[PDB]
């Protein structure tokens, strides 16, 4: 357990939620993982370090950094905590333009289709596929198990390509039953 450090830059639009949730972020990092936590206000980057005399799990530092990173991407705290709890969760990230070059109102409607009315469609994918989805403008992040994120990705991509939400919803029930 050698002295190591990680730096995770916080984008400005995630600083204020980081403030309100800081009380629930440093306890698990400093207690379970035995990590030395700090935020450099000058650089606005969360700094994590291994304490050689106290830290014991070699994977604590990287485990903590991914947890901070998950919150940074826009995932709620409790969902990010799942990265600390478990060891088999990964984040899939891809853009709308990667699937299809959509611009103007076509891009706006594609984002609206993925989220659905009142976010119903996004929750439908999240529940069926056992994953969490953050829809940041045209940037989509999916969190979950490796086999699970791929299933959610396919359901999302079908929506981008133009498949109506209703048909995608039925497909979610089928895979959900298989799960």
């Amino acid at each position: 357990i050698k002295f190591e450090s990680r730096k995770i830059m916080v984008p400005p639009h995630r600083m204020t939620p980081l403030r309100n949730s800081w009380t629930k972020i440093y306890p698990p990092l400093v207690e379970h993982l035995k990590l030395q936590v700090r935020m450099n206000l000058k650089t606005k980057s969360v700094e994590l370090r291994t304490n050689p005399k106290f830290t014991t799990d070699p994977g604590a530092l990287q485990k903590g950094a991914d947890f901070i990173k998950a919150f940074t991407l826009g995932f709620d705290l409790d969902d990010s905590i799942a990265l600390l709890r478990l060891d088999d969760l990964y984040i899939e990230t891809f853009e709308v333009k990667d699937v299809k070059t959509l611009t103007g109102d076509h891009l706006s409607r594609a984002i609206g289709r993925i989220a659905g009315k009142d976010g119903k469609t996004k929750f439908a994918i999240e529940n069926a596929t056992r994953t969490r989805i953050v829809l940041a403008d045209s940037k989509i992040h999916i969190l979950g198990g490796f086999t699970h994120i791929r299933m959610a990705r396919e359901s999302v991509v079908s929506l981008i390509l133009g498949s109506p939400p209703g048909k995608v919803y039925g497909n979610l029930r089928t895979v959900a039953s298989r799960l």
Partner: peptide, 8 residues
């Protein structure tokens, strides 16, 4: 806020 600006 502990650890906000100093090592914690």
């Amino acid at each position: 806020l502990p650890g906000w600006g100093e090592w914690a």
